[PDB]
Each structure stands twice: as structure tokens, then as C-alpha cells.
Design a protein around this nucleic acid. Sequence first.
DNA 1: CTGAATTAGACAATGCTCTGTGGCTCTAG
RNA 2: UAUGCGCAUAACGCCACAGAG
Lengths: 49, 47, 1129, 245, 245, 96, 67, 97
Amino acid sequence: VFFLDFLVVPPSRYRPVSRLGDQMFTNGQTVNLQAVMKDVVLIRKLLAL
Amino acid sequence: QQPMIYICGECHTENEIKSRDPIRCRECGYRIMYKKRTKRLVVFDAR
Amino acid sequence: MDPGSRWRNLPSGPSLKHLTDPSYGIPREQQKAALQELTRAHVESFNYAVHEGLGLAVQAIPPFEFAFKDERISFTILDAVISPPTVPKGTICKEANVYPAECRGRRSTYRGKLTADINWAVNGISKGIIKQFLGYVPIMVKSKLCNLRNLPPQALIEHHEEAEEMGGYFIINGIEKVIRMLIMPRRNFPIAMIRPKWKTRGPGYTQYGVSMHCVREEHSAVNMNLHYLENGTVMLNFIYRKELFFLPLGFALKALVSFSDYQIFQELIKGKEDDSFLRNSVSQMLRIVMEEGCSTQKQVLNYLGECFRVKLNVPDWYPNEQAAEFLFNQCICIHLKSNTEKFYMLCLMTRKLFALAKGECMEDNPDSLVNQEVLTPGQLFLMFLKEKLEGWLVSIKIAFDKKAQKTSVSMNTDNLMRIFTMGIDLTKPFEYLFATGNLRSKTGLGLLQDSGLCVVADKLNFIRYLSHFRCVHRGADFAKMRTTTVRRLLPESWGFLCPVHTPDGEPCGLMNHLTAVCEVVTQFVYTASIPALLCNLGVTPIDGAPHRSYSECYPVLLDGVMVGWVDKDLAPGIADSLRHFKVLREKRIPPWMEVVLIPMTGKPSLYPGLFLFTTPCRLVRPVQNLALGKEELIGTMEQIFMNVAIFEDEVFAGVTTHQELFPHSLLSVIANFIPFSDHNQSPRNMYQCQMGKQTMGFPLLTYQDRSDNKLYRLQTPQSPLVRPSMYDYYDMDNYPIGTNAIVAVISYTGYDMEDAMIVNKASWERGFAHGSVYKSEFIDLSEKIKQGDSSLVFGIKPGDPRVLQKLDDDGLPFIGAKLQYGDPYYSYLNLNTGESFVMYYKSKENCVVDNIKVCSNDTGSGKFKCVCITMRVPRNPTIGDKFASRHGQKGILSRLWPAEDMPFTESGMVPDILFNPHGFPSRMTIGMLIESMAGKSAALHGLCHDATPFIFSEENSALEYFGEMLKAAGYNFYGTERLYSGISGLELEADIFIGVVYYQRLRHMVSDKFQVRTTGARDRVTNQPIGGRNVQGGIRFGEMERDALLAHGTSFLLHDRLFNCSDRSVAHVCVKCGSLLSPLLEKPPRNRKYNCTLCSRSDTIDTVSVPYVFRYFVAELAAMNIKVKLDVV
Amino acid sequence: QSHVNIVFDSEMDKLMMDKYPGIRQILEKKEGLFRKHMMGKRVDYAARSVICPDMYINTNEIGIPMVFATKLTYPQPVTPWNVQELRQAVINGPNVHPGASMVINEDGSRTALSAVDMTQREAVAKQLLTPATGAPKPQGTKIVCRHVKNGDILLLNRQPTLHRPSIQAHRARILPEEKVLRLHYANCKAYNADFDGDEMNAHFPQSELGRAEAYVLACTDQQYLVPKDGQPLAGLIQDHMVSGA
Amino acid sequence: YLQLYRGFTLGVEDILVKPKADVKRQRIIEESTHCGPQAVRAALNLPEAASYDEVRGKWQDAHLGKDQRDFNMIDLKFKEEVNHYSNEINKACMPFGLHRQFPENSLQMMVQSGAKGSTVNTMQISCLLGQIELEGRRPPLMASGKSLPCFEPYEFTPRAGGFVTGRFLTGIKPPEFFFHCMAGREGLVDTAVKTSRSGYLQRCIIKHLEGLVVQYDLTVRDSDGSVVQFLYGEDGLDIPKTQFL
Amino acid sequence: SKNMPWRRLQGISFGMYSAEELKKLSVKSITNPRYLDSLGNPSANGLYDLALGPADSKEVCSTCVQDFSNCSGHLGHIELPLTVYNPLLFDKLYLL
Amino acid sequence: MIIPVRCFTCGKIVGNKWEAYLGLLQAEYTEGDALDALGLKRYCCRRMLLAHVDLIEKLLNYAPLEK
Amino acid sequence: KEIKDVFAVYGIAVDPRHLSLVADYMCFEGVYKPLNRFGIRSNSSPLQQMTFETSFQFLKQATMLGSHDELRSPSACLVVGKVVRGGTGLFELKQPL
DNA sequence: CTGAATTAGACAATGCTCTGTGGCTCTAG
RNA sequence: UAUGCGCAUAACGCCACAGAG
Ligand SMILES: [Mg+2]
Ligand SMILES: [Zn+2]
Ligand SMILES: [Zn+2]
Ligand SMILES: [Zn+2]
Ligand SMILES: [Zn+2]
């Protein structure tokens, strides 16, 4: 438990997007999870290389 | 029947404006136009 | 008094003859010059910054050079002009000029057009000049660039502006926004201060250090610090692009001049010749540079360019000598332009540091106004504009960098200067500052503040609107800090900042206001003749021998330039000669010069020297020089060595040098509108300056031309019968904010105790204090209704039963019309589809449509999609509305009392406002009693009394005066009458004080404050109610309410308020393994059973009752791999 | 690793832009999760308005406007000994005081009463007190969400809530054509209120448990002495201590 | 009673002072003009034949000094010297020497029956404002040693140090107006700053002491059973009910 | 209708999870960094995937079949390719 | 803005006295004598006309039609 | 005595029973303990420690130590939506059958 | 050749509730 | 969830200013 093999995505009803007339706005939790996930994709391509 | 009259802010000339035409005064080209007040019944209390 | 004096037309008493004059309502041939001087700082600073400061700023931008493939390319800006606001090109109009009423009603920005004559050169030869468009910069109204300049009041009425209209504001998106005057340090002056936080900055730094705020022609600003180290060594702090750099003093002093080390030594020990600790310290500082192989000026410049080239970012082909010259031009004493003058000013700052650290002079207080000045709007405009021009050149270089990386086909630049179009356009970064107040800089512009630089100049009334141009703000960083020492009223701001006019609460003492006589120096002059004038007097030049010991001499400073040294037996003679020349305007000495001679006491007083200031942005005020008999402008530092007198009686020969213009010149414009303010307690005058600005008054005269969000209008306002003479000097009957009321001070009804008040019902039913509020809603079909296809126009589908006889044929309500809740508000139809939509009126207040203006774009090519409906909401005074007198006596209306039940006097008169006499003892507003006696005399005799403060002494009292007036009118000397009871019929045994008090109606109404929430919307994360009354939300039952309800012992009442009435959710737990996260519903084959995902058994799942925020809590802890195990028993 | 740190705690990683607040900043501070949404909460069935004085209500009473009285409801269940009162309240409807906003049926379905036609509200008032219908839920009766009337208890409150008499339960007295709450003068030292523009929160308890411990425990009559030192804090003020003397 | 039969008001006849008492007041003010240098010689311990330039030189030495203990002693002796004239003026005007006495005086009936106000307020209306005292000291001096631009540097008179000796009945001259504005602003800033210091203290004490309730054995126990007191308050009694014991 | 809860929390305990216990709790491995497509719907294998809860009332779930008003919400996991520290325990890991 | 029809305190018609008041003041009466010649005896009536600022002549310089 | 001397400068008389309870709490453990986030470390309830200050550090300690909360604190009963033990919650009502 | 007290740095806290408006939330490469 | 008539539309934060008690 000192180490992570995976993050945990909390349920999507606790991470709602706040739209106001044809513009979506993501909250911070989904953005930090996405900044993990883009880097995960980058490492996965680099280990493929 | 009963055209929509708008009044220019500067020259105060009366302007008919339809839906599709660009809005500017037909004489002086000014950009703000005020809507004309027409005769229509409104009831107020004197109180 | 004195001819040509700006305060010679101040009236001896208030007249009331202008209200009934036959020339009333006829607009004058010229604007009243009393009102034009309230915004004169704003206008004149912007006028300098746009015409002359812009030329000086574009001469200050260095020729920008960079690297092509083969040859260096040089860009320089030869000229920059700002054009007045006109229509775009290709626009068919009769008038090319744009006026602020269009930009204010269409909600646009009133923009000039910045264009520059950029020259370019390849291989050192100038190939061609390019006139090039940069962007649109905003224009201050009634500047030299506004189109309302030089117009008479009839011509301002013609262009839908106010007669008597001053402008210190920008229209940014239809909104008048003012740049309030910030407090900066005193420019070009060494402020010796003590800060213990400087000890945490280096290894042996002391708390002592001399700050310096250098500005160059109001287009640059650089803060720098000398620091004192415990071995007597001085470090030189300097900031370059918001980051600090620490240099020993010998490197700077040895790089600035080609002097010998002994000659630099003699300049630093120059006052204190015999202090051997200083002698060893400055020989050690000069030895530090010698030890690092820097024996000439050129080697120091080479070393300093080597060490600062990475952070500094010159082209890589400059020498290191030039790279150090660049930092000494951008960072070190930038107000000087010569390097030897930088040496002498930096030696003076070091000598002041040595005197501070040896305990021999005293700390210049940064909080005293002596050491402070103002940031004017033209200065901020011009600094930000210079930074954006430099950034524009850098963007052109990045454009050539992109075309060298991407399109490197080696096309020569043979008028290939449509790459300027590929440069940045500085319209949007320039409008962001004026639209938000937030400062996005890479330099920081020498300010210590990042935000709050532009504020909406709203026009609730005219008393509030004047306060944006007189406000001097201390800083936004100080409201967060919990100290009470920057919020003190210090005596050095006598006559410069007002003592009463400041807010209450968080900005109290920070948001200060100028006095009525105070004014900001905004003129700029050539001071090339002044040092030769000083040397014609006894001031020896700084190179020549002073013919006496320097310990018996004064350092002379002319605007941050150390001119020389004066024999201390000659320095009062030189100071009196300069004041003589200043007040008589003789030897091109400016009338706004501060001639400060700080004397040599021989004690730890201020650091002595003859300081001479002629720069702008200083506060300056008129007194009268009694020796000359003429009016003199004295400054803030100059004032503390003068003995002004207030009254004629206080003038003593040989003691008082000066005298004020009038004894109430210590007060604001706004604080001079309080009647008899020297009889009130001072918090009650501070409250009136605040709530005089919250008054529903008469804001303006152009109601159809003004499109702003709310606008509070009093219906029938009256001139006060008892007002000061400043009320008539500033012609405040153009915009009156109150009504005279027959106020009786009686404890009669039971509803007027504890600040509440009673209004006669029959006066309210007649026109007393009736009002309106004009709400303007700007409807744009592009901005809000973004569905696609960009072809929405207001209109109806003909034959629509949703809009029949309720909207007009253009889908837009009638102008006489009323609007209840749920009525059709506007209709718009899609032209490429055919479908018409209707929008409904969602406000809960019945309004009447006032006007509807329809807007184009900037070209006259816009389509019928922008509109601006303005609606009138009635807002007559109800129970719960707040009134006020002019003395700080606020009060909620508790009761509208009938006229038959009101106590009638023996004259046959009821009051229309009852006042409870218990608002007097703890508050001591005696001026309200004098105002009522004075207003009753003013009504009876048909007069208008003077209520200017400080005109009544103890010998000739105010109550004696107005009692003799009431006695002459056949009334009581003490203001009381024989009232009867309207409920009983009997004459009341007491003798009731009644008069005429001028009341004000504040804009805080109960119709904007009540709210009730039964059920409604919930927050989508926690399922608790939402906040706000416009979104129809809930109120908090916070932590202290939880605590106070725990103290009652009512536990089911907390369980009610905090579980049943916020979020009672039902979760499913596995009772075996204790987990909310574990149950899961089966995919259907019905059955609808749950399975614990962990133990795979469907038997152990049952419901509990948790808050929904507890479920959000356990999910967010599961996101951190924290297990929450429940004991469910 | 620093992206995962920012997911858990957006202050563990310095020197990185484009971060948003992590789970620590969801939890820790003012405007956190505990202090903003667990220890204090937004709440339904409450009101807030400016207070004005009133002497001609009792000391234990509050003056509720018709603005609030026709909007704050209480879920009164229908028993055979109060069905005439609730039936008249259903007939009056949601815009006539004393009335009712809705009728909650026995299965949890909320029959909203109509402000327009009296025919629907007459049909609902006939249909009260009938036994368990064709739906197999016989456990309960209907609930009529009737308006706050004279005598209902309401917790009043003024921020900052510094001691225990800063929240007291007042009986309601319904006053027409106003928008202010009417408070007696004997309570103003307790709430520290002085009618210069103060506002007060009126929470309306929705259970018989909350009502019964607001009548007994948190009543105004029981808050006569301050808990600080047992001295009185309800008493007459300014005009009264002059005319009694 | 205040509606029907008696009225109640506050005129200017309730705050006026008789002419003979005003002559006494004015000559005590004239004597108060001259009590300057004795209060400086008393604090600096100088012989009474020392010149006015030597006393002023040593008071320029007490000021401009990092010790700041001679200077506070000089302010203390000035405040003690002018408190004598404050008390003489308040004797000369307040009980007798008012135009009306209690009970016919309405301001005295508000003060003395406890309705509203204090005796200090009535003395400030009718006698003097007295010494203006910013943070326990006389109002500050400028860096040149003068208290306002209308006064000399290191002037001995009490008028140049905040002793107002004007009243709200007849007005306040501009220097005393500025000193009084210093004092009013420090009062407003002080009440702005007290609240955030008093709130965090109460929050911390609440979050520790919240679990302590009296059990059914009469022991004040924490929420975990830890016994804090064996009888509440060492006798077991309730504070609102010990008042008549 | 009938009060669905009559059980009662007696206590709450804080601990950590094993990774096997989350991998039993998780319903979808989340892979796609793009939340929404061009047509506005949530993606497959993205952070707003419908194997988690719906984020609004306009959709239903995939694991259960309920709408937004009855779905409890479901956990997903981003399977990291390589091992990172746990920031809750990094100080105690440094000390150990 | 415009002269009130009645006095606020008592209901005396004061709206018909504004042009008479201006004609008396242009005929060189004192304002006290001009208020006496209109029969304004109570000072409630007398401040309604004494303190009236007539903003409608300033507010009609912006008259729109200018024709 | 020191709290009485603080309040008695200002003419304020807090009753002696409040002061005796506060001093008996601050001296419960044999040492004079502050009422701050360092004296709340001794508390039995992790949720009360989280709702007071530095919620993430007490959460981290409760997760490391495996701390149990008995849900008898007034903060812990309001986190989980349970009726608080003081006042009308020290007892339960039973219906005789 | 290592436990010792000390000192600098890091960090966490700093009253409560309520009402509005206005700009921006992904512009730069 | 609110409005309107089961149906149609609207479903927000962060800063900064200003204000109330
Ligand atoms: Mg108040
Ligand atoms: Zn036109
Ligand atoms: Zn299980
Ligand atoms: Zn689901
Ligand atoms: Zn009248």
C-alpha cells in the first residue's frame, strides 16, 4: 500500500461538468486525472518504443 | 399593416426595419435606434 | 483675497436664488470650473501620457536588433500616435467621429487607434519606414483625444452628454471605469527605513536599508534597495523582471564612473570624515572588487555582463561591456540618464544608509504621507503602453523565428513587411487591464500590486460619482493584512487627505479621499535652468570644494539629482529665495515646487538636506504665504516644517509663516456637505460620508441615453434649506439627493425605539420620497443564444398564440407595457429554419418598459439581434426601507402611521417623520438639533442658512443664533412646540422639539433582501441547497449556529436542520464487511437484489441513513485508497 | 509521480503550473468539505428578511409576513380530529392564507395543489381521510403541507451567533402587507439586534420532535437569563425606562 | 403613557448650560491654557529655573530617542496635569449649572434611569471632550516635532497635545476636530480587528469542550467516558438557578 | 413510503485498501483521455464513461441499469504502466 | 422634478403656486414676502415651494424631436 | 484565577463554574495542555480532529494507525447523520408491548 | 569517528452571515 | 431541480470589485 499500480477514478456523479450555454467546463478532479492519464499514454508509447 | 418604426438617436428620423435588413439609419447611418411608442391602452392606479 | 486664486469665488453664504432664476434651465455658455477641477488629475495625466509622454516613451525604447541567417536586422519605432475615436473604414455615415454616448448605449469600448512609424534596417543602413497599425487603445473621456473636447454645454446637450460633464473615466464595454489613484512611494527620493524581514535575506544583512523608487518621465518605474551588512558593507538590491538580484556596492559604483578608488572613497566618507568604522568599511567594499581582478571600469563592466547575460537575454553578439550597460540602464537609478549622476545619487543613498545604521538619522516612515505620492491614470496607461510596444517588437522577432523554422526558403526582406501583420495585436492585452483591473506584466511596472487597478465608476448619485476621482487608495495588499498601523490617521496628512471621509470596516483607513483644496501635480516642465540658478545662489557644485566642512553642509537634491552642497549659514537664505521665486513666479521656478530644508538638529532627527521636488504625481495644496501676501502651493514634506495658521486670530509675527485659505479646508468635497459637522461626533461624520454615497438621489439627466444595469431615481428631490457653501460652489442642486422633512423628536409610537423611525402615512401617500429604479437588460442573441447557424433575429412567427397582443410584431415588448411574472419578454425567430422561440420574464417585480434601443455593430452592418430593454420598477418607500439624516442617523422604517394618529402642533401641523430622542445620547449628533432649528428658521423667514463647519465659536453660538431667528419668527427660542396627542386629543405635558431636517433615502430596500426557500435546486455534488436569492436558494445553518443549538440541548432540532432539511440519503452497506462501495445491483434478466462485490454474498446488504456528503466523503477517500469500514449493528 | 501528487495534494508539487486543487483542498479549510458542507449546511424551509420592531405582539412571538407565511409549509398528517382544519386549508390553496401548498399521498406521490381552479382543490379535499386505496400501501395516511399559521414555532437567529440566546424559538403571528420580521424589544439584547438594517434567519422545524423541543427547550421564555453569569438579558429598553421612571 | 398624556422629547434646553456656570467654565479653560511646562519639568526632573529652550531641547531629546521611556512619562504627566482641569470643568457645569436639572432634564432622565447613554456622553455634550488619547497616549507628533501644522514644534500647551476643551454644544475648532477624528478612526479600526481574534479563540475552545455533558451520575464526562469533573462546577449546580441562593 | 433504513452506524474505522480489493471494486479500466466526442456523448473508456455513474439525468448507467436518481456511482481505475509512490505514505516510506 | 401637487405634510394644494411664485420673485419680492403673498402660512407648505428645485426644465433640454 | 483576572479588568464577570470546568479539562492529563490542534491529538474521535483543523494530517494519522471512531463525539455524530448524545440524546424511549 | 544542542527553514492558522456586477473559464503556436 | 403546459425550456465555478449588519 506504499505504492500505486493504479489510481482510482471516483464516480462520475461526484465529478460533474458545469455547462452554461454551449460551453462545457470540467472540474479540477477530472482535469488532474486526465493529466495523469495523458502521461500514462505517453509512457505506454515510450515503453512500446 | 402597422410598420415597426424606430427612431434614430441623432437625426431622430423614423426608420422601418424588417428582420433581414441591416440596422443603420437610412439618412445618417447611425447605430443606435430607439423604438417608437405607439398608442395602446395601459391601465395604472392613481395611488 | 487674492486675484487669480481658484478659491476666490467661494461664496460667503448659500443662496437660494438660482432655483427661481429666470435663466434656470438655460444651459450656460461655459462649464462651471469648480466641477472641472475634480477630475483634473485624471484628464491632465492622460493628456501628458498620450501626447508628450508617448513620444518620450518611444524614444526610450532601445533599437531592437536580432539575428537573421546572415545579417543583423534592426527595428526602431520612430513615432507613435493615438488617434481620436472614429468609425471603421468602409462605413457609410454622415459623422466620422464616435462619441461616448454611442459607446455607452451600445455597450462598446470607446477606443482610439494606435499606429506607429516603425523603421527597419538591415546591415546598419535604414532601408525603409513602415507606418503600421498596432491596436486600439481606450480613450479617457474629455481628454485631448475624446471627441467631446472643447465643446460648450449646449453642444454637450446636443451629443446626449451631461451639461457640466467631467470625464476621468474610460468606457470599457459600456461601463465607466476609473483608475483610482494608488499610493506609491515618493519618486526619486531615498527613503531610509527599518524592516526586520530584510534580515532574513542574506547571511549578515541588517534590518537597515534605503529604498528608492525611480521613475523615468512617467514611463518607467524601478524599485531598488541598498542594504546594510553588519561588517559595514552595502549590498545593492535591484529587480529585473520581477526577480531580485544582489550586488555589492563597489561593483556598481566602480562600473558607473571611471574614477579612482580613492575618489570613490572620498565621496562615501564625505559627511563623516572621522568615523573610522565607515572608513574601514568603504575601503573594504572597494577592496572586494579589487580582489576579483576588476581594476578598471571596463573590467567591472565585462564581469557584470558575463554574470548577467543569461537572466538578461541580449543578442549573443553584444559584448559583455554592453550587456552590463543594459542592466545599469534598465535597473539602476533610471531617472538620471547620466552615469556620474547615478554615482552621486547612489553615494548619497549610501551615506543616508550609514547615518541610519549608525543610529544618527531616523527612519522615514513609509506610512506617513510625507514619504508618499500618487499613481495617476496617465502614468499607468503610459507604462503599460511602453511595455506592450516592447512586447510587440519581441513578437515580430518571434514571427521571423517561426518563418526561419518553417518557411526558410530564403526570401529576402525587400519590403517583405507584411510580417508586421503576423505580429501580436495589442488591443486585447491592453483592454484586459482596463476591463478587469488585473495587471499581467513581465516587469510589474514598478507597482507592488497586481489587481484592483481599475474600478467601476458607478453613478448611484453624484455624491458617490465624485468620490471616484478624489479617492486615494492605499493598496489592496493591506486589506488582507491584519495590522492597525497603516490604518492610522496621521497628522502629516493635514489638508491633503480627509480625516472623516474613509469607509468603515475592512477598507477603513486604506481608502482615503483628498481634501477639497488638495490637488495632484500633473504638469511637466523643463528644469534645465534650476541647477545653474542654485549655483548662482550659494550652492557649490558637486565637483567643486564646498569652502567649509561637509559636516557643516547640506546635500542638495533637485528631483533625484544631487546638485551640490550648501554652507549651512546660507541654506535658509537659499530656501527663502526659492520660496520667494516660486510664489512670485520669477525665475521659471514652477509654482508646484517643494522647497524642503530639513535642518541639522544635531540629534537623531530626519536626514538633513535641502530637497527640491518638481516632479508630477505629488499632492500639493494652497495656503497663503503671509510674508508675500500671495497664495502658495505647499507639498506634503514641505508642510511639516511650516507653521500654517487656521484663523486670522492665530497669526503671530515671527511664528506663523503661512495661513490656510479657509478653516474648513481640511475636509473633502463630500465631507464639506455635512451641515454643522463640528457639532457631531466623528464616527457619525464618517458614517454620513459613507451613507451619503448610498442614497437614492437624482443621478443624471440623460435617462434614455444611459444603458446601465440599475439606476436609482428619487422622484421629487429638494434643495436643502440648511447646507454649507460648498454645496453651492459645486452646484449640487443639479443633482439633489434628498427631501426636507418636518421631523419631530418625540417618543410617541412604540415603534421608533432602537434606530427605527416613523413616517406619516399621508405624507407617503402624497409624494414623499417616492422613487424608481431603472433596470437595463442588454439582450444579445449571438452571445447567450448560441445554438448554431448564426441567423437569429428578433421577431415573431405570425400567428403565434404565445405572443398575441403581448409582444409587438418585431418580437419585442411595447414601450408603454407592463411586465408581470411569466409574461413574454422577447421573441426571436430562426431565419434559416423558421421556428420562432419566445423568452419569458423571470423577475418577480412588476416593471414598466421605459425604452428599447436597438444596436448595430461598429460598421452599421449588424443585424437585428442586439437590443437593450430598460424597465422601470416603482420602489416607493415601504416598511423596511432605510432612511438617513445628514448626520449618520440611519434607520429602518418601522411603521407608516396615520395622519389622524400623528401628534399635531398648535400651528395645525403634523410631522411627517417621528424621531426617537434616544438616538442622541450615545451618538452626540448635536448638529441634527441645530439643523432642525436652522431649517425651521430657514422655512419660516424664507432664508437659507449657512451650515459650514467652524463658523460658529463659543462666543457666538449656533444655538443662540438660530434661537434668535426662531424668536424673531414668533416661535420658541429652544425649538420646541406645544404638540397635542392625535390619539388622545390632550395636549402633551412635555414641550416637543420639532424642526425641519433634510432626509436621505438609502438604496437598501427590503424588496432586495427578503428570501424564503421551501424546496428547490440542490448542489449537484452534495445534494444540499444552493446559495443565493436570485437562484432561489438556501441559507446557511453554519458552525456557530450548530454550536449554539448544541448548547440548548436540542439534538433533534440539529438533526432536523442539518440532516432532514439538507441531505437525508439512503446508502446500502454490506453489514458483514462494512462497506458502502461494495454493494452492486444485478443486471436484470424482476428480482432487483444486491450483491456485495467483496464477499460475493447477497444476504448481508441492508440500508443505512447517511448524509449525501458522507457518501461523497467515502468516495473521495476511496480515491486515495483509504478504506472506511462501518460498524452497522 | 508529481501528477499523482497533485491528484492527492496540489501543494505537494511546487514548480508546476496548470494544477487544480486536489483532494486535500477538497477537505481542508474554511470552504472545505468538513467546515463548509458537514459542520454547517445550507438548509431548506428557512427564511431571511430585515427585522422591524413590534410591541403589540408578545415577547415570545415573531411577526411573519404574508410573503413568508404563504410559502413556508409544515407537513401535517391527516388524522380524523384535524381533517376539518386541513380540509379548509386544502380548499384555500397555496395563495390564500391559511392554506396548503400540496398534499402528499400515502405512497409518497406529491399531489401539487393548483392555484388556478378551485375544482381540483375541492376534489382533493373530498379525497382526504379515505382509507388505503388500490395501491398495496396501507401503512400511512396523507400529509397536507399546510402553511405556517398562528402559533407555529420558528427558530430565529442573528449572525454572529456568539452565545446561546442568539437562537431562540418564537411563536408565529402572521402579519399582512409587509416583508419584514417583527421582533419584540425585549429580545434585542439577546440577539444584539438594533433595527438599523439587521437581518434575522427564521428556520421552520418540520418534525414534531423539533417542534416539541423548540416549545419546551429553546423557547424565548426559557432564555431569560444569560448563561454567562445568570443575569437577565431580556428587559425593556429606551422609552420604557424613561416613562416608567 | 408617552402617547396619551405625557410626551417625551429632547430639545436643546436639555443640553444648555447656565451663563454663570459658563463663565466658570471659560475661566477654567483660560487657566488650562497655561499648564504646559510644569508637566514637562516634572517628568524630566529639571530645576524650575530652566529655560523654555532647555526644557524643549530635552523633550526633543526624549522624542527622537530609541528608549521611549522619558517620552511616555512626559505624556503621562501631561494627561495627569489636564485631568485636573477636566474635573474642575465637570464640577462647574454638570450637576448644577445645567439649565434644567433632573427630572425635568430629559437627557439626565435618559442617562440616570438607565435608558440610553452615560454621564461621560453628557459631559462631552455640555462641558468638554477632554483629552484625546490614541492607544493610551497623546496624539502623535510629526517627524519635525509638531503635533499639527498649526502648532509650534514641541509646544507646551495642552491644546497642542489633544486636550480638546471644546464641546459638541458649541462646536469644535479644526485642530481638535482632527484629533477627534484620529480617535474615532482608531475606535472603528479596533472594532474591525477585535472580531477575528475573538472568533478563532471561541472556535478552538468549542472544538475542544464540545463533548462535555453532564451524565446521569452527576459527572461531567467527555464523549469517551473520561471523567473531567465529579460534580459540575465543584458543587453540581446550574448557573441560571444559583441566583437567589 | 416505508422507512428503508432502520439499521444504525455504531462506529467507523479508517484503514487502507489492498489493490486486490479495489480491483474487485472497480468496474471499468479507464483508458481514453478524451472525455467527450464530437457528438457530445461521453466516450468509451474515458473519464466520463457510463460504466461509472451518469453525471446527469439525461443518461443511464451500464453496470447497473438505473438513472441518475438511483445509481449509487461506480469506481473506475487508471491502470498505471509503472509503479509510483503513494503520496499519503511517502513520508513514512522515506523514514522506513 | 416637477412641483408637487399637494404639500407633503398637510394636504394643501401647492402645485398651482409655482408660476405665481416665480412671477412674484421676478417682480422683486423677498422670498419670505413672496411666500406670504401666496398664503403659505405653515412652514411645511412654505418649504415645499421654497426648496423646490425644478429639474424638468433641465431635463427637457434633451427633448428628442428638436423639430 | 488568571482568566478571572483577564475578564475583571473590563468589568466582566464570567461565572466560576465555567472557569473550573475549563481548567479541569485543560489539566485532565496531569499536564497543562493547550486548546489548539496539538492538544486535539489526544482526542478519541478522529472525525472531531478532522473537523477542527488540518483534516488531512489527522486523516493520514487515522489511516496509518487504523483508528476507530465510536461516533459519540458531537462532530462525529453529525458527520454520519446521527443524533447527538448530549441534551435530548442521552436516553432512548421504549414502547411497552 | 558520533551523539550533541542549536538554528534556519517549512508550514498552518488567522469571525460570521448575506447582496450584487463584471470578466474569464484555451489563447498561443 | 425550477417554470410553463406526462410534455418543452433553463440546469456553474474561479477571481476581482462594491456593499449590508
Ligand atoms: Mg445594527
Ligand atoms: Zn439617423
Ligand atoms: Zn461483504
Ligand atoms: Zn451504476
Ligand atoms: Zn403644508
